[PDB]
Design a protein around this ligand. Sequence first.
Ligand SMILES: Nc1ncnc2c1ncn2[C@@H]1O[C@H](COP(=O)(O)O)[C@@H](O)[C@H]1O
Ligand SMILES: [Mg+2]
Length: 390
Amino acid sequence: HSPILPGAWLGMVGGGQLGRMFCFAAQAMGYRVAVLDPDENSPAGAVADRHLRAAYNDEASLTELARLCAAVSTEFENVPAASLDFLARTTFVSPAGRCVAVAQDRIAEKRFIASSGVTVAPHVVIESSDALAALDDAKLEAVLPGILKTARMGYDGKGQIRVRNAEEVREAHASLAGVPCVLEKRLPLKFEVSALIARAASGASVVYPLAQNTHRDGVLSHTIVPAPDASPTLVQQAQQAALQIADKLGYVGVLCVEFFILEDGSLVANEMAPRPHNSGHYTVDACATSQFEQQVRAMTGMPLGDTRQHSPAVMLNILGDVWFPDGPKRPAVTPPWQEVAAMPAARLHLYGKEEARCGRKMGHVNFTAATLEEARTAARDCARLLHIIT
Ligand SMILES: Nc1ncnc2c1ncn2[C@@H]1O[C@H](COP(=O)(O)O)[C@@H](O)[C@H]1O
Ligand SMILES: [Mg+2]
């Protein structure tokens, strides 16, 4: 792979906030970015050097994107692997369609992670209605109470149903229209962490510090780095697990692997994203090389960047609910950004989305400081200010 040098066109399939942040990182280094996204108002397309407004399966636009760009990546985990393989006919695609296909499917990803030697949650795979009908209640009850999750990803807790008994599993499967699913045992969680790595085509890799993530209603709420409750032994185990997965996958790009730490202290892998990740946004303001810059380097064949964390950090997600302090039925109220910017630790990132809606990620605020406790205090003060907490 002869390195793709500054000045080239780089392609981005998907135009959300992750694609927007990729644009800034690539453009700062002198690259030009073409974003393929069907939405007219895409956050990434707004800042890109070129926006191809097209469906992800549109042959003419895929051909146009691959002709223009020396390398193409994605920020969209559910992108069709066939689209990435189509692009790969004429240009370099990182990560490959084959890798994204494993990572985007909950059944395949848990099989693959287990085959890498990494523990996953006890679960039962439900390929179809016919397969579920042949399973006895006892096979289901072994993983109950549990969560029934569609294999095809639903972001933000979508496509998931709590189930307490076998009859609830069977009704839940029908409610999900019979699609392939994984039934996972609900586990006793002490805390949650994510490992963030980047891997080059050569097999070289870098690792970020472990992040400790808190979710509300299945949506990431905040991230604390370095993880305050993860020992150096656990950090190495989680980083190594993510590297072992990436190596076995032949993965080129940025990979985020989310883990549970149970009450007994064991490490359980849950999910992996074949892209930069919401829990990696802190890297923009806390680390020498951000995850978006790693995505540039990996897809261009350039050397991977130093991951050194120069400042402890906390990321706070900003959801559209922040605009509805008097409830969802009442009018929107613009959040108090002037008071956020008055916090010395606050690094404000707003995505340019026009309409605030509950559950919608509108931005995030990174808090960096000399010490983690100062950063955590500022994030909590900001959460109270924004009515994220009382
Ligand atoms: N097997 C499980 N046991 C306990 N909590 C879970 C389990 N699976 C998912 N969750 C919770 O739901 C969140 C999002 O789930 P997921 O859609 O699997 O990423 C996770 O970050 C957990 O907090
Ligand atoms: Mg995944």
